[PDB]
């Protein structure tokens, strides 16, 4: 289904004022309710970091509580930035693909080339995932992006953080 606990980079979607802490897992008692976007990483969901050369980087977050980073993930178009900061790399990602309602079960849309996002082959992108409607668990709401730039931290900001 879909929805250590070591918080190990940031996300930044400038476009709706969210920077949030990005944490190993996707519990809901140590990551989404601590107000922390989830990394999926256990009983075979794991995927790949964005420091891999191709691969699909999953998250989940929270729609209606701690903080609700994901609230209005379905206000970005394409070509809005979603950045996630490492210690040693900003990744930035564009927004590509938007998936409004979909079963809890679809787990397919973090595959390495996610089902229904309309991506050809492999790439680097990044999964966002969260409930719909609002204050239910009802359905999820799926949004994809694609790799832009990597771009070493001695280098600053990029654009997109300005």
């Not at 206000?75 to 979603?82: A, F, M, S, W």
Request: proline letters at 9%; aromatic letters at 8%; one cysteine or more.
């Amino acid at each position: 289904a879909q929805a250590p606990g070591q918080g190990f980079a940031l996300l930044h979607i400038p476009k709706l004022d969210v920077v949030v802490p990005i944490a190993e897992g996707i519990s809901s008692k140590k990551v989404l309710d601590r107000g922390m976007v989830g990394h999926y990483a256990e009983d075979g969901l794991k995927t790949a970091m964005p420091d891999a050369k191709a691969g699909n980087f999953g998250l989940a977050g929270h729609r209606n509580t701690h903080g609700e980073p994901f609230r209005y993930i379905n206000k970005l178009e394409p070509g809005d930035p979603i950045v996630v900061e490492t210690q040693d790399k900003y990744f930035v990602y564009k927004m590509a693909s938007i998936l409004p309602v979909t079963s809890p079960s679809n787990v397919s849309v973090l595959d390495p080339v996610p089902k229904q996002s309309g991506f050809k082959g492999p790439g680097r992108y990044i999964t966002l995932t969260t409930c719909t409607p609002e204050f239910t668990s009802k359905y999820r709401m799926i949004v994809w992006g694609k790799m832009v730039e990597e771009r070493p931290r001695s280098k600053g900001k990029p654009d997109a953080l300005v």
